[PDB]
């Protein structure tokens, strides 16, 4: 497309150009209002529901300045979040870490969006104000003049909710005149009347105004919780006053009051101050009620996700936890439940009715006089507020609050996905218990015991150097056929010879199912036979999760890369590559076709906003890829690593492709960072963003390339700071040659530990560079070990990780108390019955738990190969075994001793009444 060439040419980060709303520069007044607005809404405001502190890496009012700096760098200087988080951290720490900088970046889109609507809505209010001034200068009882307080409300708007209130209020009073204004400015009116426009066409304004308080004054009595405004009293009864407005549309005084009460009720419901006060109150007081439908009472069984909450009575929305409200909306969308949000406690009590919100607020419009004239006006005021709360506000506030509780619950699920992806990308390359990498033998198999095991040997660069098929390695040494033992002995010798010849540093076995334990026990023994012969150095034997390798094997890429290879052997290569570098491997399966979503991040991940989840996951790549740094020469030499270049800060997929395209066209390595400007024609702002994160292996270069090699290019020192890094090395040696000094310091890094950096921070501050304390401590740490891998060192999976990885279960899907289906495999001697679950756990039913009644011989109840329903009592994660029961008293759980814990607000009285 034309856009791709404009993106390649333009000196801005690709993700700044691909952002929905274009990034525009900001004046210091806009940045200060935005910094305060982002601080209130994104950092100070607590969630309505109980959310875990998901900051896995309230922030105080000092954060407002740190946000003002961060927005200045993003909007005016065009730095992405990683460049700020790694190369401007002195201006944003300690309050903002890299995820908070992404949170600021995401909320700047929301601020810009709000300011755009608030400006266009101001253009509408100014045109309407001008149109009224023209009609007035050319007054009837229905003319409300749009004044400076109406404008000051709009300029004071702090959210899209408050904006929608100010717009709905404007439409109520002026929506009828909008088409007239636009035709006067130089199209036909969309027509429909809610009863309010009928009441205005009947001229009820002269009666609606006579109820006493104007809508704002009632708003102020609500806001302040006392009568700040006294109710103005008309000197007649309402039913007598109504006679003056009788016509064909309102034939009776009772109908004229019903029309005028409607017209007042809508004015109360669309007053911005009343909505603001009520919304504020509704978020404090709202109670969630849930009842199951005729479908729900049958379908929400013990195992269903909606079980713990199918009947809720009076649960405060402040007490919903984590994702619970998303599970409630899913169960409602499936038609299983009906949800109801009320500001009142629901119940049949007389005190229950007295305690309602309506009995509190009626007091803010009543006139406290006992005369029958005032008694009857207070009855009309009562019915106007009752209609304003019940028909408009309680409906509209329940829908607004439902959307907020659902957005908080979806955002928890998105944060839970990103927290899981972070935990996968943070694992370092395996280092045996290094500069030429590790040779890895990945071993893969299918769950079907007759399919062949495949092994693939990958060199430290990520190239497949050799491969092996073992058709009988799945057999057990205790097999009843000696032929199986013999055929496996040939494959064991074949693997033993392959290990002896190829000498890999680690063997990885697929976490496919429990037979991965059998492969690991055999592979560990074969490696121990080489150790007993003292033929070879220690080889690692690792269980590696195969979920990523399955997504690779099924990808278009795994065929395009190796068309000739069987699919199980393609999952053997990804199991070797994952332990060499998890980040380079995870970048392979994450294509422009959005293949990433096939990974099981969270049980609800398909029910959150797709575009928001993809941003939240690609931000976990961008965080780690820029911390780890990308070797461009490894990308050019080995096509396998080319996927990381798009996640480098500033680059993205179009500029990333273009960088490799020029270096391929020139047929040159990237020899020094200056070549990004001098060969690749990269603009200064894109160079600024990426230059610190691109690695160049200066030790790999030689011959005529020796003419220009900056030794710092292999490190996180940014090119803007090379002068200070050279000065720091020259001064650490006290030399009376900067390149020689730097080489001498890089060979002898211990000499730096005496150097007082704070005096140099004062000198750079004095030279006008500002505070550089954190930068100088980082340059000193960087010269002490160039590109030290900041990832968490590899560890073998623990007992809980192995169990979850091989059963494909979690503590939530395989819990004590669960009901399950199993096949009987045998009888233990009788001590109990052996079974196998579908997930591969070997279940055991001790003989006393086989029935409610004493069974002496299990053969009276069960046969080998029989399928049986059972209930879990205890789990042994180390042994892959569970203590099951099938006593009918436990199966139906007649005492309710095993069933999942219900919510605290579960309505046992409705449950008992429906039974």
């Amino acid at each position: 497309t034309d856009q791709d060439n404009e993106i390649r040419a333009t000196d801005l980060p690709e993700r700044f150009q691909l952002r929905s709303i274009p990034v525009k520069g900001a004046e210091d007044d806009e940045l200060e209002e935005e910094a305060d607005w982002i601080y209130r809404n994104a950092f100070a405001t607590p969630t309505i529901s109980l959310q875990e502190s998901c900051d896995y890496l309230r922030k105080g009012p000092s954060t407002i300045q740190k946000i003002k700096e961060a927005l200045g760098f993003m909007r005016n200087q065009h730095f992405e979040v990683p460049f700020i988080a790694f190369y401007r951290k002195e201006y944003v720490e300690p309050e903002l870490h890299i995820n908070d900088l992404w949170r600021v970046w995401q909320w700047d889109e929301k601020w810009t969006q709000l300011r755009i609507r608030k400006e266009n809505l101001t253009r509408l209010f100014e045109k309407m104000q001008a149109y009224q001034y023209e009609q007035i200068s050319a007054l009837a009882d229905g003319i409300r003049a749009l004044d400076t307080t109406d404008m000051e409300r709009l300029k004071d708007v702090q959210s899209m909710d408050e904006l929608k209130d100010v717009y709905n209020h404007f439409l109520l009073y002026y929506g009828r005149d909008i088409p007239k204004m636009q035709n006067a400015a130089k199209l036909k009116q969309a027509s429909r009347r809610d009863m309010y426009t009928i009441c205005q066409s009947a001229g009820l304004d002269g009666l609606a105004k006579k109820f006493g308080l104007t809508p704002e004054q009632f708003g102020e009595n609500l806001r302040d919780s006392y009568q700040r405004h006294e109710t103005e009293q008309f000197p007649a009864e309402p039913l007598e006053l109504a006679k003056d407005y009788v016509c064909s549309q309102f034939p009776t005084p009772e109908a004229v009051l019903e029309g005028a009460r409607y017209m007042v009720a809508l004015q109360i419901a669309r007053e911005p101050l009343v909505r603001q006060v009520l919304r504020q109150t509704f978020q404090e007081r709202a109670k969630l009620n849930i009842t199951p439908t005729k479908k729900g009472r049958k379908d929400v069984d013990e195992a269903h996700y909606a079980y713990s909450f199918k009947y809720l009575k009076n649960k405060p929305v402040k007490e919903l936890r984590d994702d619970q409200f998303l599970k409630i909306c899913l169960a409602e969308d499936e038609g299983l439940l009906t949800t109801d949000i009320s500001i009142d406690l629901k119940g049949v009590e007389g005190y229950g009715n007295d305690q309602t919100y309506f009995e509190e607020i009626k007091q803010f419009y009543y006139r406290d006089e006992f005369s029958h004239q005032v008694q009857e006006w207070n009855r009309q005021r009562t019915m106007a507020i009752e209609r304003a709360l019940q028909q408009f506000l309680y409906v509209q506030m329940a829908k607004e609050l439902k959307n907020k509780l659902l957005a908080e619950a979806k955002e928890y699920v998105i944060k839970a996905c990103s927290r899981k992806l972070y935990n996968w990308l943070r694992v370092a390359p395996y280092r045996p218990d290094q500069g030429k990498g590790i040779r890895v033998l990945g071993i893969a198999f299918s769950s079907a015991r007759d399919h062949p095991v495949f092994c693939a040997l990958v060199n430290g660069e990520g190239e497949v150097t050799d491969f092996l098929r073992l058709p009988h390695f799945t057999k057990r040494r205790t097999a009843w056929r000696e032929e199986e033992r013999e055929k496996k002995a040939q494959d064991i010798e074949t693997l033993k010879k392959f290990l002896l010849n190829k000498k890999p540093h680690v063997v990885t076995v697929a976490g496919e199912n429990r037979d991965a334990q059998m492969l690991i026990e055999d592979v560990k023994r074969i490696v121990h036979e080489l150790d007993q012969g003292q033929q070879l150095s220690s080889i690692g034997v690792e269980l590696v999760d195969n979920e990523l390798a399955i997504l690779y094997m099924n990808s278009k890429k795994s065929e395009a890369e190796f068309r000739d290879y069987p699919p199980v052997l393609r999952q053997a290569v990804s199991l070797a590559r994952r332990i060499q570098d998890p980040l380079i491997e995870f970048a392979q399966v994450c294509s422009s076709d959005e293949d990433i979503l096939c990974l099981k991040f969270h049980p609800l991940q398909e029910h959150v906003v797709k575009e928001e989840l993809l941003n939240a996951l690609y931000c976990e790549f961008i965080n780690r890829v820029n911390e780890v740094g990308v070797d461009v020469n490894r990308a050019i030499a080995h096509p396998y690593s080319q996927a990381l270049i798009q996640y480098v800060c500033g680059l993205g997929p179009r500029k990333g492709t273009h960088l490799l395209k020029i270096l391929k066209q020139n047929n040159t390595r990237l020899e020094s960072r200056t070549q990004l400007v001098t060969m690749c024609h990269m603009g200064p702002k894109v160079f600024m963003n990426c230059a610190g994160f691109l690695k160049i292996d200066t030790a790999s270069l030689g011959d005529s390339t020796d003419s220009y090699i900056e030794v710092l290019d292999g490190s996180r020192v940014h090119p803007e700071t090379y002068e200070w890094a050279r000065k720091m090395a020259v001064d650490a040696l006290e030399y009376d040659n900067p390149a020689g000094a730097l080489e001498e310091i890089l060979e002898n890094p211990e000499r730096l530990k005496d150097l007082d950096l704070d005096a140099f921070a004062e000198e750079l501050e004095r030279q006008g560079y500002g505070d550089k304390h954190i930068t100088l401590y980082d340059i000193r740490a960087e010269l002490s070990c160039r590109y030290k891998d900041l990832r968490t060192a590899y560890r073998s999976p623990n007992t809980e990780e192995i169990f979850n990885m091989l059963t494909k279960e979690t503590p939530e899907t395989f819990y004590i108390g669960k009901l399950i289906i199993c096949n009987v495999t045998g009888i233990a001697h009788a001590i109990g019955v052996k079974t196998r679950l579908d997930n591969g756990v070997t279940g055991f039913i001790p003989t006393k738990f086989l029935s409610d009644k004493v069974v002496k011989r299990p053969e009276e109840r069960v046969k080998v190969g029989m399928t049986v329903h059972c209930r879990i009592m205890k789990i042994d994660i180390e042994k892959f075994s569970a203590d099951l029961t099938c006593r009918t008293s436990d199966l139906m759980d007649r005492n309710n001793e095993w069933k999942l814990p219900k919510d605290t607000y579960y309505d046992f009285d409705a449950e008992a009444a429906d039974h």
């Binding site: 000065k727 720091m728 001064d731 650490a732 006290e734 530990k753 005496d754 150097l755 007082d756 950096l757 005096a759 140099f760 000198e763």
Partner: peptide
């Protein structure tokens, strides 16, 4: 002209 001090203990 400037020099960073090795003054730290």
């Amino acid at each position: 002209v400037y020099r960073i001090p090795k003054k730290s203990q």
